[PDB]
Design a protein around this ligand. Structure first.
Ligand SMILES: [Zn+2]
Length: 194
């Protein structure tokens, strides 16, 4: 039982975009084109851009879910470790077990799937401004990749799906994510291997 991670631009030409933030030590969130991999700090703003060729209709929703990248771990539900789960870092909206939160959107909705037990977070799709090319969603990852009893150094993917009001799939994309203390150094380090 594993959610699909297959790229699907769909009829609205759905793509993801990311800020070009570089690898200086001060960066809180940085994306690697070569690795298709986001490096970000704990609970910090992670901007993920939604790019479309044509505007999805009103009622369109945007969902985010994490799964383990490695096949021998893919059936295991990605959740926070007990320490962070039990931490006093609640925004009053997100369930304490959920890795992925959305910041700055009061219409955010969280799901524990009654059948697969997987966690996800969904928001209404907003079109970009007229003078803008994309819609930005501010995600927070609430556990480190290294958390013992949590992800425990196992790599994860974030899957972003576009769905209609009735939950039908409209588009899908994904990126790898590492939650760490120094995203710039870790990104630069992982890329020197190339
Ligand atoms: Zn943790």
């Amino acid at each position: 039982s594993v959610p699909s991670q297959k790229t699907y631009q769909g009829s609205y030409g759905f793509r993801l975009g990311f800020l070009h933030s570089g690898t200086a030590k001060s960066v809180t969130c940085t994306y690697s084109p070569a690795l298709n991999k986001m490096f970000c700090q704990l609970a910090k703003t992670c901007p993920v851009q939604l790019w479309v060729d044509s505007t999805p209709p009103p009622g369109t929703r945007v969902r985010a879910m994490a799964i383990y990248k490695q096949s021998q771990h893919m059936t295991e539900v990605v959740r926070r470790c007990p320490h962070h789960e039990r931490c006093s870092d609640s925004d009053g909206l997100a369930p304490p077990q959920h890795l992925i939160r959305v910041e700055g959107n009061l219409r955010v909705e969280y799901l524990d799937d009654r059948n697969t037990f997987r966690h996800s977070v969904v928001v209404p799709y907003e079109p970009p401004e007229v003078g803008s090319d994309c819609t930005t969603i501010h995600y927070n990852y609430m556990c480190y990749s290294s958390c013992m009893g949590g992800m425990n150094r196992r790599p994860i993917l974030t899957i972003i799906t576009l769905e209609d009001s009735s939950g039908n799939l409209l588009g899908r994309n994904s990126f790898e994510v590492r939650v760490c203390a120094c995203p710039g150094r870790d990104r630069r380090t992982e890329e020197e291997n190339l």
